[PDB]
Design a protein around this ligand. Structure first.
Ligand SMILES: [Ca+2]
Ligand SMILES: [Zn+2]
Lengths: 1280, 94, 647
C-alpha cells in the first residue's frame, strides 16, 4: 500500500510517461528539466531551482544577509547525478513516511483530489483549464504532451534551507485565495535539517539528551504539504495578513515576520494566536468563494480542450469541494459540509498534529527558533526509516528521542556553518557608568516577542438583537486524536481523479509567479541607554571564551562583564570559594564529588509556600540568575513573588483591553406567547455564549502576550544552567591539567562522565523550573486577566436582567399566568456566574495529564523492564535487550511472570544488555526492583553459605544480589576492588514471619554521591555510604541463577524485575510497590493468587496464634478460633508456629463468569469446610437473635435456604498486603455481614456480623474480619 | 503515655482536671472520649508542690541574675553507679 | 496605626488574619537532606529553645552539623564487657562429623551473642540518646502551648473589649462570641499539627543519631570481636589431631565470620518503634473525617450510619431505600417526603475553618427549578448545593451578605457524578471538581463568617436522586487526592453501562462506539448473512440493534473485568455473535457456534468497555459501503476499542 509504486533511479532513461524532460510555465524561455511522476498529479524535479523564477537564478549568497536566524549556501549542492539520485530517493522516502500515518494518508489523498479548478473560461457557459496549472511532457519522439498536475517538489534556491510553496498567477484572479487553486511548486531538500533546543520534555523524559536536536525532515515536508493543501483549495490566508509586533523597546525584537497563514499551519498554540472574530471572517470568506465556484459550475453548459465529459469534470469538482447536488444537477454548498472540510484542511492538517503522529521531538512553537543547520542522509535504512524516522526501534536511539540528539547520534548529523553571522542582527544594550559604558549585543532572536495590540480585534462591544428565531452557535470542540479518527474512518480513499487527455498547450507556457509583498528589512544595531543591569546582561555575564587560562566564578555581575576570566554565578558564595580554590592532586576526586553534589544541591532547591493559591513551589535562584525584579537576596525574590504575584516575572505588563459588552435588544411579539418565551430563552442562551467568548478572548491574549514571556524566561534559565555547568567543568578541567603526568595517572578522570552527571542535574532542575513557571503563567491568567473579563460579564448580566424583566412586564398581557415563573428563570439564571475552566480552552491543563506525565517519567527511566508477554519472557523497555532462557527455568502456569529458578546450571536467565545501557561510571545513579519468594531454610548446610542470584559483575566490578541464611544482600564494587554491601536480615525464629517463604518486594537505589539504600515492601531498611567508590564498570549481561548455593534442593521465585536509570525516591518506591501488588486479585498467605478448589488452612489477622476448628458438624454445632498453634522446628535453623493446624476452607465457584480458577475481587462464592477429610458448606441462619450470626459447617445437601453466598474482597496490608475479607449474603441480596469472630462464654465463634460493614476500612491494625488463606507449599513444608 | 512514662515528672508539668461520675465518666469511659471530654480544671492546681531538681541561674556579663528557671526530676531513685560498664552480656543462655 | 475595630466585619477580618498568620508561623517546616535522608524540620525550633540559635538560621546550621548537634551530652556510650572466646580442649581429637556439628552449635551461639550485643547498644541509645530528644520534643511542645496561649489571650482581650464597649449589635456580639470559640478550636488544631511536626522531626533525628553515631561504634566493636573469634577458631582447627588437611580448610571456611553476620540495622524497625497503640488511636481520633456515610441492607432492615468516629448524629426517614451505586449501596431520595440530616458541631463552620464535601450523585433530572439538595444554613448564612437548570449551584454566604453563587453545568444526565467541593481558609481558595475535572477555582477572600447550624440537611427537593459515599472533611482537598479517590473507588471489578451503573447480564442495551457516541450499532445483511455496522446515512432508518450479554453461569448477575461473555441480539429469533474469516462480526443462528469474548475496561474511562477474542480486540473498521463494520483487529487507533452500553 505504498504512495510511490515505482522505485526510480535518476539515471533511468526518459519514457515519456512517468520519466521525462518537462517544461513548467515561465515568463520567458525555460530550459527543460528531468522530472519524475511519483504519484498521480505529483512530480519531483531533482534540481536546484533556478527555473521557477528566472529573476533569482544565481545560487550564490546575497549581498546582504537574509534576516532569518539560520541560512546555508552551497552552490555546488545537487549538481551531480549522484546527489540527484539521492534527492529523489530521500524525497520519496519522506512521502512514504507521511503516507504511513493516518493523518498523512488523508493529507496526501486530499492533495491529489485537490485538482486546480478550471477557471480559464471568459465565457461562463464553457469550462476551460487554466494553462499555468499544467506542464509539457517531452516524449522520446520529440513531441510534447500537455498534462495537468497538482504538486511539484523541486530543489531549493540559493538558500538551501529555505523551503516554501510557489505557484503561478492569473492576470486578475488570486488562485490561492479564491478557492480555485493553482499547481504548487515546493522548494525542498531532504539532505539538510535544523537544530533546536528543547527543555520541555524533561517532565516525561528526565534522561533527555544534552545539546541540539534535529528536526525530523518528515515534519518539515509535511509542513509545506499543508501550505500546498491550502493553496490547492484556494483557502490560503492573504500574505499581507501578518502578526505585527512591537519593536521600539530595548527588550523587544528588532522585528519579526510571521503570517496568519503560517500560524494556521503550525497549529497548536501558535494558531490560537488568531482570535475568534478573524477566524470567523476567514471561514465565511472562503465559504462564499466556494459558493461562487458552485454558481460558475451551474452555468457551465459544455467543456473545452479535453475528450473527457462535462459530467466527469463537474463530478471531479463536486468531490473536491464537497458540493451538494439536487435532483436537477444544480450545485450548492452545505454550510455543514463546508465547515467539516475547511476544518480538516486548517485544523486537522497542522504541524502540531503531525508531530503527535510521528512521535518525534519538535519545536512546540515558532518562537523556539532554529539555532543551527545540519547535513543528513536519510536514504539508508541504518540511518532513517519510514516507521521510526531517526529514532530506531529496539535500540538506544528509540529512547528519549536520542535518534534526534545530534551529539548522541552524531554520525547522522554533521554540523555545517550557519551563514547567518554572529550577532548579524542585534540590539545594543548599554548600562550607564555603574567607569564608563559597558555595552553588549543581543541576538534578535534572543529578544522578547511582544504582539501589537491591533492584532486582537473583537466585536465584544457590539450589541445584538435577540429574536424568537435567533439561534445558537455550537460548542466548537477542540481537536483530538479521536476526532481525527472520526474524519479518518469516514474519509474516502477510492476515487482519485483520472489523468485526462487535454488539448495541447503551446510549446512554452507563459506565466509568472504570484507576487510576494515587499517587506522592510528591520533596523539593525539600535542602541539603548539603561540605568540598570538587564536580564540580557546577567545572562551574558555567565559566558566565557575557551582558552588556556583559569577562569573563576564571581558573585559580581560587574566584575564578570568586565573580565574575560570572570564568570558570574548565582550559586552561593560558598560554592564560589570552593570551585575557585587551588586543589592538591590527592584531593582532586573528592573535590569534584563535592562540586557535583553542591551543584546538584543548589540547582535542585525548591521552596514551598503555603500562603498563596495557585503557586505551590518557588525556585528562588531564578531571581539572581536573571535579575528578575531587583534588589539582593533570593529571599527578596521568594518574598516579592508571594507578595506581588506572578507579575514580577514579566518583562512587560500586557494590555488586556475588555470593553463594556454590547447589550441585548429583544424584539417583541404581540399576543404571541410562544414566540415571546423563545426570545427570552434565546437571550439567556446567547448570554452563556457571551461568557465563553470573553473567556476565549482572554486566553488568546494570554497565550500571545504572557505565556510567551514565561516561555522565554524558561529557555533562558536552561541557558543559565548550562553556562554554570560549562564554567564549573572548565575550572575542574583546568585544575586537572595542572597536574604532573604521574599525578594524573593515579586519578581516573573522565570529563564526559562528569558532563553526563551535570546534565542530569540540569534536567532535574528544569523539571522544577518548568512546573514553577507553568503555575506562574496560569496564576497570572486566573488572577490578573480573567477577573477583568468577569467584571465586564457581571455588568452585562445586570443590564440583561433589567432588560429581560422589562420585557416580561411590558408583555405581561401575552405572558399572563407565566409572569412569576419567568421572573424566576431570569433572576436565577443571571444571578449565577459561569466559572472559568482553563482545561476547556487549552490542551495541556487537564488534571489527569499530570498523573499521566508521572507514569511516563517512571516508564522512561526503565532501562530494563522484564515481563512475560504472549508466549515469551521479554524486555518491554525501548532498548529491547535480548533474553536467553535456560532449559530448566520454570514458569508458574497460573501467573507466568512468576519465575522459578532451581539450583541447576540449566535453570537460568541471561539478559544481554545493549551497550548504551551497560553501566560504566563514577557518578551515575541507578536503581533495581523486583519481587522474590525465598523458601524457608531447612538445613544447616544453608548456614553461612552466601550464594548469588542476580549477577552483574565483570572482572570484580559491578553489582549483584545475593542471599544467605535469613539475608538478602546487595553488593557494589569498583574497578579497584573497593566494595560496599548492604543487607536486609530476617529471623527464622519467629511465631509468624512477614518474610519467610512469602513474596517480598525489594528495591535498591544507588546515589554515587551519597548512599546505597535497600527497601523492603516499600520501606527503607538500611543504607550505606558509597561515595568512596571509584569507577564502577558492570557486566555486559545480567545473570539470574543460583551461584554458589550448597543446598541442592534450594530454589527461588522471582518476578517483575526492573532496572532504572535514576535513584528512586520514597514516593516512587511506594507507588511502585502498590501498583505491582495487583490489588484486583485476592492473594493467599504466601502472596500467590488465591484460587478456587484449593484447600487452605485459616488464620485470623487479629489473633494469629489461633486457628479455625469445628466444634460439631451440623446446624447445632459451630466453628471457632482455637489454640495454641504449636510449633515446628529444626534446631539452630528455624523455630516457627505451625501453619497447617486447623480446619480447611475451600472456595467454590458460584457466580464465576469464566474458568481460570483465580479469585478476583468481588467474586460471589461458596465456602466449603474440610473436617476429618470430608466437605461441608459454610452457612448460617441469619434469623437467630443478635447481630452476630454464628457460623456452622453443614451437610452440603442440607443447606436449604440458609445464608451461604460469600462476596470475596481484597484489601491492602502493610508489610504483608495479604488482607482478605468475606462478606456473607442471604439469597435476597441482603448483607449478613463480614466473617469474623465473637466471644460467647470463653469460646471464640466464627460470626457474620454487620457491625463490620459499619466500620471504615483500616481501623487500627487489628480487625477480626481480616483473614489469611494458607495452602500447603513446598517452601514451608511441615507435616500435615 | 508511651515514652518514659514513669519519668514524666521531669518532662512535663501536670495540670489536673476534675472528673465527675457519671457526668464526665461512665462505663464507656469519658463522655465524648479522652480528647473531647469537657473537664473542669481543678482548683487544686495552685496547691501543687514545686521542688526543682535543679535551678538554672541566667546572669549577664555583670554577674547579675536575669532569670531563674526550674528543672524538675523524674522522681526515680538513682545510679549507683554506671550499669552498662559493669554489665556482662551472658554468652551461655542458662 | 489603624482606626480602632468597630464593625463586627472589622473584627472578623482581624481575627481571620490573626489565625492564618498563626498557622503559617507555627506549622512552618522545611525539608532538608541529612546523613540518613530527608527530614521535615521545624523551622522555628532554634528560636524557640535557643538551640543552634547563634546563627542567622537554625535550619542551615542543623543541616550542617547533623542530628547529634541538638543535644548536650554527645558521648555516653560504654562498650559492654564480653565473655571471652575459648574453644574447649576436649574437641581437639574429635572425628569430622562430630567436630563439624559441634562447631555449628558454637556458630549459632555466636550469632545470637552478636544480636544480644546490638540490643545492648539499642538500649543505651534509648536511655542515653533518645531520652535527650524526647526532652527536646517536650520542651518544643511546651513552647507551642506557650505561644498558643499568648495568641488566645490576645484574641480574648480584643473580643472581651468589643463586648465591653462598642456599638456592635447585641445579636452581632453573640455571633462573634460563638464564632471566636470555633476559631480558638481551629487554633488548637493548628497547634496540634505543629506538635506532630516536632515529634516526627525529632524522632527522625534521634534515629539518625543511632545510624550515624551509635551504630558505627557497634560495628567497630563487632569487627574487633569477630576478628578475635576468627583467630581463635583458625588456631583451634589447625590443632585438630583427628582430621586431615583438606578437612581443616573446609572447616575454617565453614566457621568464619564477616561483617554481614552483624549488620542488623533495620531503619523501618527504628521508625516502627514510635507507632504504638496510642499513636494509632490518636491518628484515628484526629483524622480529617467529620462524616463518612455508610449504608447496607440487613434482612428486613436498611442500615445507615457514620464511620468518621466523630459525634455525628443521623436522623432519617424510615422508608428511605438503598440501591447499589458505584462502589456500595446508595441512598434513594424520592424528592417528596424523604430527607436525611447529619449533626456535628463542626458542621456550623465559622470564620477560620476549612472543609471539604464530597459524594456521588445520580439525578433523574426533570425540572429546571432551583431546589435544595444539601446544605447547612441558619439565619441565612452557610452553604447550600441546589439543583438548577441542568446543573448544580454551589452557594456560600456570610453574615455580612457576601456571596458565592456558582453554576456547575450539565450534572443531571441521569449518570453518576463525583462532586468535590473544597474550602481552604489558609489559601483563601474555593475548589470545585466534577468527576476528574476541576470546574471552578475561585478566591473566597471576600467571604468572611459562614457560621451555620450544626446540622447538614440532605433534602433533594423535587428531584428524586441517588447519593453515595457522602463525606465531610475538616481539611481542604487537592486535585491529586480527588483523582485518587475517584479512580480508586471506580475499579472494583465491575463493568459499567453508559450511566456508570453496573452492566448486567440478561438486560437489553444498545451498543455505541466511543468515537461515534451518538450512533448505535445496527445490523445489515450482505450475502444472505448479517453483519453489524453504524448509521452514517442520517436517518437511513436502520433500527438500533438490541443487545443482551449472556454468561455460561446462570447464577451470574453483574458483569466483571475478565468475564467470558456471549453477545446476543433480538431481531426475529435470537441471534448470537460470531467472528468471520475476515474478522468481521456477524449475527448467527446457533448459540453453539457463538464466540466467547472477554470483556474488560479502561481504568480511566468509567462508562466504557473493551472486547477481545484470542487476544484480538474489537473495534470499528474503515469506511466501506459506506458502512463501518465491527471487526476483530488489533491495528486501529486506541479510541476505536472503547464501547459503551446504553439502556
Ligand atoms: Ca567574563
Ligand atoms: Zn510555513
Amino acid at each position: 500500500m505504498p504512495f510511490v509504486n515505482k522505485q526510480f533511479n535518476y539515471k533511468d532513461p526518459v519514457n515519456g510517461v512517468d520519466i521525462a524532460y518537462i517544461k513548467i510555465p515561465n515568463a520567458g524561455q525555460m530550459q527543460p528539466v528531468k522530472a519524475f511522476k511519483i504519484h498521480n498529479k505529483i512530480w519531483v524535479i531533482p534540481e536546484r531551482d533556478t527555473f521557477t523564477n528566472p529573476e533569482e537564478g544565481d545560487l550564490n549568497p546575497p549581498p546582504e544577509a537574509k534576516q532569518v536566524p539560520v541560512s546555508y549556501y552551497d552552490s555546488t549542492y545537487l549538481s551531480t547525478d549522484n546527489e540527484k539520485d539521492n534527492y529523489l530517493k530521500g524525497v520519496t522516502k519522506l512521502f512514504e513516511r507521511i503516507y504511513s500515518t493516518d493523518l498523512g494518508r488523508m493529507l496526501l489523498t486530499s492533495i491529489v483530489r485537490g485538482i486546480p479548478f478550471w477557471g480559464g473560461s471568459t465565457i461562463d457557459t464553457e469550462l476551460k483549464v487554466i494553462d499555468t496549472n499544467c506542464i509539457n511532457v517531452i516524449q522520446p519522439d520529440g513531441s510534447y504532451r500537455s498534462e495537468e498536475l497538482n504538486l511539484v517538489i523541486i530543489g531549493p534556491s540559493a538558500d538551501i534551507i529555505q523551503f516554501e510553496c510557489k505557484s503561478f498567477g492569473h492576470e486578475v484572479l488570486n488562485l490561492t485565495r479564491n478557492g480555485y487553486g493553482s499547481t504548487q511548486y515546493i522548494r525542498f531538500s531532504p539532505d539538510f535539517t535544523f537544530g533546536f533546543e528543547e527543555s520541555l520534555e524533561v517532565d516525561t523524559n528526565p534522561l533527555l539528551g544534552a545539546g541540539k536536536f534535529a528536526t525530523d525532515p518528515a515534519v518539515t515536508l509535511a509542513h509545506q504539504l499543508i501550505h500546498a493543501g491550502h493553496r490547492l483549495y484556494g483557502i490560503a490566508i492573504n500574505p499581507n495578513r501578518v502578526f505585527k509586533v512591537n519593536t521600539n523597546a530595548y527588550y523587544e525584537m528588532s522585528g519579526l515576520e510571521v503570517s496568519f497563514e503560517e500560524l494556521r499551519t503550525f497549529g497548536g498554540h501558535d494558531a490560537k494566536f488568531i482570535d475568534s472574530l478573524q477566524e470567523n471572517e476567514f471561514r465565511l470568506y472562503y465559504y462564499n468563494k466556494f459558493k461562487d465556484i458552485a454558481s460558475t459550475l451551474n452555468k457551465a453548459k459544455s467543456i473545452v480542450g479535453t475528450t473527457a465529459s462535462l459530467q466527469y469534470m463537474k463530478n471531479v469538482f463536486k468531490e473536491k469541494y464537497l458540493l451538494s447536488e439536487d435532483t436537477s444537477g444544480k450545485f450548492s454548498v452545505d454550510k455543514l459540509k463546508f465547515d467539516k472540510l475547511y476544518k480538516m484542511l486548517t485544523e486537522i492538517y497542522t504541524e502540531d498534529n503531525f508531530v503527535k503522529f510521528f512521535k518525534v521531538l519538535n519545536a512546540k512553537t515558532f518562537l523556539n527558533f532554529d539555532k543551527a543547520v545540519f547535513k543528513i542522509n536519510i536514504v539508508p535504512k541504518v540511518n532513517y526509516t519510514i516507521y521510526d524516522g531517526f529514532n530506531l526501534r529496539n535500540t538506544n536511539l528509540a529512547a528519549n528521542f536520542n535518534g534526534q540528539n545530534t551529539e548522541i547520534n552524531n554520525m547522522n548529523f554533521t554540523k555545517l556553518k550557519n551563514f547567518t553571522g554572529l550577532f548579524e542582527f542585534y540590539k545594543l544594550l548599554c548600562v550607564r557608568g555603574i567607569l564608563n559604558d559597558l555595552c553588549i549585543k543581543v541576538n534578535n532572536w534572543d529578544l522578547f516577542f511582544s504582539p501589537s495590540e491591533d492584532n486582537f480585534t473583537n466585536d465584544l462591544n457590539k450589541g445584538e438583537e435577540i429574536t424568537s428565531d435567533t439561534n445558537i452557535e455550537a460548542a466548537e470542540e477542540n481537536i483530538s486524536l479521536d476526532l481525527i479518527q472520526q474524519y479518518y474512518l469516514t474519509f474516502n480513499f477510492d476515487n482519485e481523479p483520472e489523468n485526462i487527455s487535454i488539448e495541447n498547450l503551446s510549446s512554452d507556457i507563459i506565466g509568472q509567479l504570484e507576487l510576494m509583498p515587499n517587506i522592510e528589512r528591520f533596523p539593525n544595531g539600535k542602541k539603548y541607554e539603561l540605568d540598570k543591569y538587564t536580564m540580557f546582561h546577567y545572562l551574558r555575564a555567565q559566558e566565557f571564551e575557551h582558552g588556556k587560562s583559569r577562569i573563576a566564578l564571581t558573585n559580581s555581575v560587574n566584575e564578570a562583564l568586565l573580565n574575560p576570566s570572570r564568570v558570574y554565578t548565582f550559586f552561593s558564595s560558598d560554592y564560589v570559594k570552593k570551585v575557585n580554590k587551588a586543589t592538591e592532586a590527592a584531593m582532586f576526586l573528592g573535590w569534584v564529588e563535592q562540586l557535583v553534589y553542591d551543584f546538584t544541591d543548589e540547582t535542585s532547591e525548591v521552596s514551598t509556600t503555603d500562603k498563596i493559591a495557585d503557586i505551590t513551589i518557588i525556585i528562588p535562584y531564578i531571581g539572581p540568575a536573571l535579575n528578575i525584579g531587583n534588589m539582593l537576596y533570593k529571599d527578596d525574590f521568594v518574598g516579592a513573588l508571594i507578595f506581588s504575584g506572578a507579575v514580577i516575572l514579566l518583562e512587560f505588563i500586557p494590555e488586556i483591553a475588555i470593553p463594556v459588552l454590547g447589550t441585548f435588544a429583544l424584539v417583541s411579539y404581540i399576543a404571541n406567547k410562544v414566540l415571546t418565551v423563545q426570545t427570552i430563552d434565546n437571550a439567556l442562551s446567547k448570554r452563556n455564549e457571551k461568557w465563553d467568548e470573553v473567556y476565549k478572548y482572554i486566553v488568546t491574549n494570554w497565550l500571545a502576550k504572557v505565556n510567551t514571556q514565561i516561555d522565554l524566561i524558561r529557555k533562558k534559565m536552561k541557558e543559565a544552567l548550562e553556562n554554570q555547568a560549562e564554567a564549573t567543568k572548565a575550572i575542574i578541567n583546568y585544575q586537572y591539567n595542572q597536574y604532573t603526568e604521574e599525578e594524573k595517572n593515579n586519578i581516573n578522570f573522565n570529563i564526559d562522565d562528569l558532563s553526563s552527571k551535570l546534565n542530569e542535574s540540569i534536567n532535574k532542575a528544569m523539571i522544577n523550573i518548568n512546573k514553577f513557571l507553568n503555575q506562574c503563567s496560569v496564576s497570572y491568567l486566573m488572577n490578573s486577566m480573567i477577573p477583568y473579563g468577569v467584571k465586564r460579564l457581571e455588568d452585562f448580566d445586570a443590564s440583561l436582567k433589567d432588560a429581560l424583566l422589562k420585557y416580561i412586564y411590558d408583555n405581561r398581557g401575552t405572558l399572563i399566568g407565566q409572569v412569576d415563573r419567568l421572573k424566576d428563570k431570569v433572576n436565577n439564571t443571571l444571578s449565577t456566574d459561569i466559572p472559568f475552566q482553563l482545561s476547556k480552552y487549552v490542551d495541556n491543563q487537564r488534571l489527569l495529564s499530570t498523573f499521566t506525565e508521572y507514569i511516563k517519567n517512571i516508564i522512561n527511566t526503565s532501562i530494563l523492564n522484564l515481563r512475560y508477554e504472549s508466549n515469551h519472557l521479554i524486555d518491554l523497555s525501548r532498548y529491547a535487550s535480548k533474553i536467553n532462557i535456560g532449559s530448566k527455568v520454570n514458569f508458574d502456569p497460573i501467573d507466568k511472570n512468576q519465575i522459578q529458578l532451581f539450583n541447576l546450571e540449566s535453570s537460568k536467565i541471561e539478559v544481554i544488555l545493549k551497550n548504551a545501557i551497560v553501566y560504566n561510571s563514577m557518578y551515575e545513579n541507578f536503581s533495581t526492583s523486583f519481587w522474590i519468594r525465598i523458601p524457608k531454610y531447612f538445613n544447616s548446610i544453608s548456614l553461612n553459605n552466601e550464594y548469588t542470584i542476580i549477577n552483574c559483575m565483570e572482572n570484580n566490578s559491578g553489582w549483584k544480589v545475593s542471599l544467605n541464611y535469613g539475608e538478602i544482600i546487595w553488593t557494589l564494587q569498583d574497578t579497584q576492588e573497593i566494595k560496599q554491601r548492604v543487607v536486609f536480615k530476617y529471623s527464622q525464629m519467629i511465631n509468624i514471619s512477614d518474610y519467610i517463604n512469602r513474596w517480598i518486594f525489594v528495591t535498591i537505589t544507588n546515589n554515587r554521591l551519597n548512599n546505597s539504600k535497600i527497601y523492603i515492601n516499600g520501606r527503607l531498611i538500611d543504607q550505606k555510604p558509597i561515595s568512596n567508590l571509584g569507577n564502577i564498570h558492570a557486566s555486559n549481561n545480567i545473570m539470574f541463577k543460583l551461584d554458589g548455593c550448597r543446598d541442592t534442593h534450594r530454589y527461588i521465585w522471582i518476578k517483575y524485575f526492573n532496572l532504572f536509570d535514576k535513584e528512586l525516591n520514597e514516593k516512587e518506591i511506594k507507588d511502585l510497590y502498590d501498583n505491582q501488588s495487583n490489588s484486583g486479585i485476592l492473594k493467599d498467605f504466601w502472596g500467590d493468587y488465591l484460587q478456587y478448589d484449593k484447600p487452605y488452612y485459616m488464620l485470623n489477622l487479629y489473633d494469629p496464634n489461633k486457628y479455625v476448628d469445628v466444634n460439631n458438624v451440623g446446624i447445632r454445632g459451630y466453628m471457632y478460633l482455637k489454640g495454641p498453634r504449636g510449633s515446628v522446628m529444626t534446631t539452630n535453623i528455624y523455630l516457627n508456629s505451625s501453619l497447617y493446624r486447623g480446619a480447611k476452607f475451600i472456595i467454590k465457584k458460584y457466580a464465576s463468569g469464566n474458568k481460570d480458577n483465580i479469585v478476583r475481587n468481588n467474586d460471589r462464592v461458596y465456602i466449603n469446610v474440610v473436617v476429618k477429610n470430608k466437605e461441608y458448606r459454610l452457612a448460617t441462619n441469619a434469623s437467630q437473635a443478635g447481630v452476630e450470626k454464628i457460623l456452622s459447617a453443614l451437610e452440603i445437601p442440607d443447606v436449604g435456604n440458609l445464608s451461604q453466598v460469600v462476596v470475596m474482597k481484597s484489601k491492602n496490608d502493610q508489610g504483608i498486603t495479604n488482607k482478605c475479607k468475606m462478606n456473607l449474603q442471604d439469597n435476597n441480596g441482603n448483607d449478613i455481614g463480614f466473617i469474623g469472630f465473637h466471644q460467647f462464654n470463653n469460646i471464640a465463634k466464627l460470626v457474620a456480623s454487620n457491625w463490620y460493614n459499619r466500620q471504615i476500612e483500616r481501623s487500627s491494625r487489628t480487625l477480626g474480619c481480616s483473614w489469611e488463606f494458607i495452602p500447603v507449599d513446598d517452601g514451608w513444608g511441615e507435616r500435615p | 503515655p508511651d515514652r518514659f512514662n514513669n519519668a514524666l515528672k521531669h518532662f512535663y508539668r501536670k495540670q489536673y482536671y476534675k472528673i465527675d461520675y457519671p457526668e464526665n465518666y461512665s462505663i464507656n469511659g469519658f463522655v465524648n472520649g479522652q480528647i473531647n471530654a469537657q473537664l473542669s480544671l481543678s482548683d487544686r492546681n495552685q496547691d501543687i508542690i514545686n521542688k526543682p531538681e535543679e535551678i538554672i541561674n541566667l546572669l549577664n556579663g555583670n554577674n547579675v541574675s536575669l532569670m531563674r528557671s526550674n528543672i524538675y526530676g523524674d522522681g526515680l531513685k538513682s545510679t549507683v553507679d554506671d550499669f552498662y560498664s559493669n554489665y556482662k552480656i551472658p554468652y551461655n543462655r542458662a | 496605626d489603624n482606626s480602632p475595630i468597630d464593625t463586627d466585619k472589622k473584627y472578623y477580618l482581624w481575627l481571620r488574619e490573626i489565625f492564618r498568620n498563626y498557622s503559617f508561623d507555627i506549622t512552618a517546616t522545611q525539608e532538608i537532606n541529612t546523613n540518613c535522608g530527608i527530614n521535615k524540620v521545624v523551622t522555628w525550633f532554634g528560636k524557640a529553645l535557643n538551640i543552634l540559635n547563634t546563627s542567622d538560621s537554625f535550619v542551615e546550621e542543623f543541616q550542617n552539623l547533623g542530628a547529634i548537634s541538638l543535644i548536650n551530652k554527645k558521648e555516653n556510650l560504654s562498650m559492654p564487657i564480653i565473655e571471652s572466646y575459648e574453644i574447649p580442649n576436649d574437641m581437639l581429637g574429635l572425628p569430622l562429623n562430630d567436630l563439624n556439628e559441634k562447631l555449628f552449635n558454637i556458630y549459632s551461639k555466636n550469632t545470637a551473642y552478636f544480636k544480644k550485643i546490638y540490643y545492648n547498644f539499642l538500649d543505651q541509645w534509648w536511655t542515653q540518646y533518645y531520652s535527650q530528644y524526647f526532652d527536646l520534643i517536650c520542651m518544643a511542645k511546651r513552647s507551642v502551648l506557650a505561644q498558643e496561649t499568648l495568641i488566645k489571650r490576645i484574641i480574648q482581650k480584643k473580643l472581651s473589649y468589643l463586648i465591653g464597649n462598642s456599638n456592635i449589635s447585641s445579636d452581632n456580639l453573640a455571633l462573634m462570641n460563638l464564632t471566636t470559640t470555633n476559631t480558638l478550636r481551629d487554633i488548637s488544631n493548628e497547634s496540634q499539627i505543629a506538635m506532630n511536626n516536632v515529634d516526627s522531626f525529632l524522632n527522625n533525628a534521634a534515629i539518625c543519631v543511632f545510624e550515624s553515631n551509635i551504630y558505627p561504634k557497634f560495628i567497630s566493636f563487632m569487627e574487633q570481636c569477630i576478628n578475635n573469634i576468627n583467630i581463635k577458631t583458625k588456631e583451634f582447627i589447625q590443632k585438630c589431631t583427628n582430621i586431615n588437611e583438606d578437612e581443616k580448610l573446609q572447616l575454617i571456611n565453614q566457621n568464619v565470620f564477616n561483617s554481614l553476620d552483624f549488620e542488623f540495622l533495620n531503619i523501618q524497625n527504628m521508625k516502627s518503634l514510635f507507632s504504638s497503640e496510642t499513636a494509632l488511636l490518636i491518628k484515628e481520633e484526629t483524622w480529617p473525617y467529620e462524616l463518612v456515610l455508610y449504608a447496607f441492607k440487613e434482612p428486613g432492615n436498611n442500615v445507615i450510619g457514620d464511620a468518621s468516629g466523630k459525634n455525628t448524629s443521623i436522623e432519617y426517614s424510615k422508608d428511605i431505600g438503598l440501591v447499589y451505586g458505584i462502589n456500595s449501596d446508595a441512598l434513594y431520595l424520592n424528592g417528596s417526603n424523604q430527607s436525611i440530616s447529619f449533626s456535628n458541631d463542626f458542621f456550623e463552620n465559622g470564620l477560620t475553618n476549612s472543609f471539604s464535601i464530597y459524594f456521588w450523585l445520580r439525578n433523574l433530572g426533570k425540572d429546571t427549578i432551583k431546589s435544595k439538595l444539601i446544605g447547612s444554613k441558619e439565619d441565612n448564612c452557610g452553604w447550600e448545593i441546589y439543583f438548577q437548570d441542568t446543573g448544580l449551584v454551589f452557594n456560600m454566604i456570610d453574615s455580612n451578605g457576601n456571596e458565592k453563587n456558582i453554576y456547575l453545568s450539565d450534572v443531571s444526565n441521569n449518570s453518576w457524578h463525583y462532586i468535590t467541593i473544597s474550602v481552604d481558609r489558609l489559601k483563601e481558595q474555593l475548589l470545585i471538581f466534577i468527576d476528574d475535572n476541576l470546574v471552578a477555582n475561585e478566591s473566597i477572600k471576600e467571604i468572611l463568617n459562614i457560621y451555620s447550624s450544626n446540622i447538614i440537611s440532605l433534602l433533594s427537593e423535587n428531584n428524586p436522586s441517588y447519593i453515595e459515599g457522602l463525606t465531610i472533611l475538616n481539611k481542604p482537598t487537592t486535585s491529586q487526592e480527588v483523582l485518587s479517590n475517584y479512580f480508586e473507588v471506580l475499579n472494583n471489578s465491575y463493568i459499567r453501562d453508559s450511566n456508570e451503573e453496573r452492566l448486567e447480564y440478561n438486560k437489553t442495551y444498545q451498543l455505541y462506539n466511543y468515537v461515534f457516541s451518538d450512533k448505535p450499532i445496527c445490523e445489515v445483511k450482505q450475502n444472505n448473512n448479517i453483519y453489524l455496522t453504524i448509521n452514517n446515512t442520517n436517518n437511513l432508518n436502520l433500527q438500533a440493534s438490541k443487545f443482551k450479554l449472556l454468561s455460561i453461569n446462570p447464577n451470574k448477575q453483574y458483569v466483571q473485568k475478565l468475564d467470558e461473555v456471549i453477545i446476543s441480539v433480538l431481531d426475529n429469533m435470537e441471534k448470537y455473535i460470531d467472528i468471520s474469516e475476515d474478522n468481521r462480526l456477524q449475527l448467527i443462528d446457533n448459540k453453539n457456534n457463538a464466540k466467547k469474548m472477554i470483556i474488560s475496561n479502561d481504568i480511566f474511562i468509567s462508562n466504557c468497555l473493551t472486547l477481545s477474542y484470542n487476544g484480538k480486540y474489537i473495534c470499528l473498521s474503515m469506511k466501506d459501503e459506506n458502512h463501518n463494520w465491527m471487526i476483530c483487529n488489533n491495528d486501529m487507533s486506541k479510541y476505536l476499542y472503547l464501547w459503551s452500553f446504553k439502556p
